[PDB]
From Swiss-Prot, chain C:
Function recorded in the entry: The periplasmic linker component of the MexAB-OprM efflux system that confers multidrug resistance. Functions as the major efflux pump for n-hexane and p-xylene efflux. Has been shown in one study to be involved in the active efflux of the autoinducer N-(3-oxododecanoyl) homoserine lactone, thereby playing an indirect role in quorum-sensing; but has been shown in another study not to be involved in efflux of this autoinducer. Over-expression of the pump increases antibiotic and solvent efflux capacities. Implicated in the secretion of the siderophore pyoverdine.
Knockout-associated phenotype: Disruption of MexA, MexB and OprM significantly reduces active efflux of N-(3-oxododecanoyl) homoserine lactone/3-oxo-C12-HSL/PAI-1, but not N-butyryl homoserine lactone/C4-HSL/PAI-2.
The organism's place on the tree of life at top rank: Bacteria
Lineage of producing organism: Bacteria, Pseudomonadati, Pseudomonadota, Gammaproteobacteria, Pseudomonadales
Encoding gene (name): mexA
Residues of the full protein shown: 76 to 126 of 383
Family: Belongs to the membrane fusion protein (MFP) (TC 8.A.1) family.
Note: In both X-ray crystal structures approximately the last 100 residues are not ordered.
Induction: By growth under severe iron limitation.
Name of the protein in question: Multidrug resistance protein MexA
Location of the protein in the cell: Cell inner membrane
Native organism: Pseudomonas aeruginosa (strain ATCC 15692 / DSM 22644 / CIP 104116 / JCM 14847 / LMG 12228 / 1C / PRS 101 / PAO1)
Quaternary assembly: Component of the MexAB-OprM multidrug efflux complex, composed of six MexA subunits forming a hexameric tube, binding to a MexB trimer, which interact with the trimeric OprM outer membrane channel protein. OprM is thought to not directly contact MexB; instead, MexA joins MexB and OprM by forming a funnel-like hexamer anchored to the inner membrane. MexA may initially form a hexameric ring complex with MexB prior to OprM, then OprM undergoes a conformational change as it contacts MexA, allowing the periplasmic gate to open.
Amino acid sequence: KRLFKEGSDVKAGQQLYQIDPATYEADYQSAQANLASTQEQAQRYKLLVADQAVSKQQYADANAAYLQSKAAVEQARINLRYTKVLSPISGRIGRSAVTEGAL
Amino acid sequence: KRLFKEGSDVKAGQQLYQIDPATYEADYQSAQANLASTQEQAQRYKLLVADQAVSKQQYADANAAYLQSKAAVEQARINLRYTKVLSPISGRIGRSAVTEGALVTNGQANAMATVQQLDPIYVDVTQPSTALLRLRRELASGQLERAGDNAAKVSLKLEDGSQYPLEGRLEFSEVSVDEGTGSVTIRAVFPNPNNELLPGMFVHAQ
Amino acid sequence: KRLFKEGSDVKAGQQLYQIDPATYEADYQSAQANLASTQEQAQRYKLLVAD
Amino acid sequence: SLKLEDGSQYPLEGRLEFSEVSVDEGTGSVTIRAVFPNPNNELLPGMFVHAQ
């Protein structure tokens, strides 16, 4: 959708466009699922090496994936956020040089 | 299939194309099968740790796969949904630049079809910034037939010279300015219920 | 469910139990989805080698 | 005050800041900016005008 009237007045921070978020929203929820998982996995292993119950290697590999996840999620979050195009400033906005459905 | 007549009228939300859903529909059903499985597996293990019957590790790995599945299904669902191309808006759709049996890719540059709303229809008029101010005044006073909160009533004279049977509003809100020539462009809105008016016509608002 | 009264009379062919079909029913629909897919894929390719 | 290209006299009055904004080192000319209020959008960019 292109939620603004060509020639109208918009406020800085106002959503001007909406990029189909279906998948971004999807990847993000996916990412978070993963993180929630790995995080736990790690936090647990962190107490097992503490008791020799698990090799330093294992806990390493664990905390390794945990970081990877945390990383992925943040990146997912950012892309999702960008699906809502906003107006950098406040002023009069003109014609939309892009058509709905455009790519 | 390409379920629409080139040159016809489509309603927003109307299926315009149908991408072979064979595999997507297949992957989706597949995904759901998997989820249905892992989900149960997890829900069970959740009661086993509750009774030490199973290590926290196992229940973890379980709920882990469960989440992965739930994830996959949702993604499957979305792709399947996209196999049914729909019209973003209501209007007149032209000639499909894609024929049944063709291969289409998500991200492809060229666009399959193009819909257009032609009723009402705009008439882009360009005047010198000064001239627009003038009329804006003539409106504020009364020298002009107030059409709306900020528009004047206007008639249209086609290129051939004929008088367009209907009357439209000429909104004074600027839509674009040519900082170069300093010219302004405003829009008139006329009714076009019989599609007598088409884009590109050179006309004159009176 | 265990749809029968202990001590009752049952007829041969009568459902006596019901195992949660949730997944089986799921795998089956899944399977058919797949087949419907591959089948088409094949039937098409059968005419392409032909040419 | 501002006088439009049609000769009209823009009602509102504005500031003419003297801090230079740019210099055409070629012609040595200097460019400064006036700041007028435009609450009704009567004023649009690209208008050739005179600051009085």
